[PDB]
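so ive been stuck on this for like two days lol. basically i have the seq below and the ligand is zinc ion, smiles is in there too. i just want the complex predicted, nothing fancy, no docking runs or whatever. if the output looks off dont worry ill sanity check it later, just need somthing to start from for the group meeting slides
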Amino acid sequence: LPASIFRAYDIRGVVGDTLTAETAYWIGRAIGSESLARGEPCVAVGRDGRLSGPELVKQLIQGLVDCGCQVSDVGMVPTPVLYYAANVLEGKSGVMLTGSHNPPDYNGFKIVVAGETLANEQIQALRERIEKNDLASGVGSVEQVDILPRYFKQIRDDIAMAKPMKVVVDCGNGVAGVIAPQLIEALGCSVIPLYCEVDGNFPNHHPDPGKPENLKDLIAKVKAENADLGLAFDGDGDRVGVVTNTGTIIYPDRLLMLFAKDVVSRNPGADIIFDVKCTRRLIALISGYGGRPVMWKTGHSLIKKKMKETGALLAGEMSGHVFFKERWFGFDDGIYSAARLLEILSQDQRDSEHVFSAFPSDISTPEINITVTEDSKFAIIEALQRDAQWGEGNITTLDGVRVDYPKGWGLVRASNTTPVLVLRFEADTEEELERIKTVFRNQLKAVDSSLPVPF
Ligand SMILES: [Zn+2]
């Protein structure tokens, strides 16, 4: 049975509750059926370092084999490593059992089928195969594969560190510690490990570098050891956080600026994708270097579809997923992105603080949240889209309502997993900021005079 675990970009839930082995079995069955339906019997399977996993894989794999698929099992590995398998093995399908950065009892499935990362209706399709028992049946197969070494090798062969660097690597007790300290070490660095022991209990901070609180120990170690950079991976390793030698947290939009400058120098006119939460500075910077800027929707999986659709050589989103296609395969991977970042910084005699500090900075507000209600969440964005008036602002309604003015912008959208409206604003001078926070405040009040707007 049921459902709130068939989300938009994956399947997630509590390991001994909404998601039990049983549920995992009928999901592997769905996945196996669809892959077959796309002409793909070969599927890979990889898992993260969760407690609930060791078994689960099992119910998942039993589900694939009871379809007739040839399962290539890669055991415990980083998410991008699973994605790597689905790109290099024979089958272009792959399934990673994972709960990302969620708490220890959460787990789930990120699914790739015949090359495509399933989303939205593609995932529901899966569920609705169980609700009618429309799955396939067959005499599957299971083979053990060890891909990590070839993954490890591929990057090492690709990267060229120029000077040496001392780096603090924090894994959060998630699955990155199986190759991240090592590879970065192998890459040509000295590594101060922080929580790089796979432990699904998460004795320390959870592996979510998206929240600053989880970079406090990281930020202190960098300073205390006079390291050149600090890195933090999420639980399953498709996300990376960055801090400079002085402890400044680099946000992904700023990270992309460094990456776009690099990618575009070797690929004139390259398409570069970022989301509606990324600084407009990114737009001008990409253009200035000769590239084609492409603002798209938020959602690792959506960014990914857009990339194949546009031929983009690089993508990123504010949640930290960085997607390299130049020299790579086009999927998100915090490990490879780290590598790529070390590559660039190693070739600059300045320290990491100045490299990033040199980029233009506007006046930005932090992310603002407004608890509304589940019932009203989407309808508020719709009312704005229908009736808000924004002057000569350029309106992007790809994902909520983003309005770009010449000297600043603002965003309002609905969270897909909380009854909350999420906002952001940025502008060069403070007088233009408040004039933008004012146009939004007013349009919101025009929707509902009783809505609480804290700005
Ligand atoms: Zn992740």
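The chain has four domains: 1-146, 166-243, 244-362, 363-455. Residues 371 and 420 are 4 Å apart (CA to CA).
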